[PDB]
């Protein structure tokens, strides 16, 4: 059955989305990682679902 309606807005990611690439402990160091990251200050779709989604 269909009972969900979606509403789209746009917001700013700021500096959210940083994760630990590998489980290798590192203390007091600046490390460079090439990985799939959420770019800083990106447009993040904010979806409201009220009850093709």
């Amino acid at each position: 059955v269909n009972l969900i309606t979606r509403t789209q807005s746009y917001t700013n990611s700021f500096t959210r989305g940083v994760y630990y690439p590998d489980k290798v402990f590192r203390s007091s160091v600046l490390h460079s990682t090439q990985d799939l990251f959420l770019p800083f200050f990106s447009n993040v779709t904010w979806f409201h679902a009220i009850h093709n989604p």
């Binding site: 059955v1 269909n2 009972l3 969900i4 009850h51 093709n52 989604p53």
Partner: protein, 36 residues
């Protein structure tokens, strides 16, 4: 190999409306909940 409805949603207590039929699986994992 689930086939879902075009508007899948959980019923809570059951899982009938999410997937109509279930068949041959490939993986499964039961652990502590993600959301607290």
């Amino acid at each position: 190999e689930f086939q879902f409805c075009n508007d899948p949603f959980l019923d809570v207590e059951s899982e009938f409306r999410v997937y109509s039929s279930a068949n041959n699986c490939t993986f499964e994992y039961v652990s502590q909940p993600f959301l607290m």
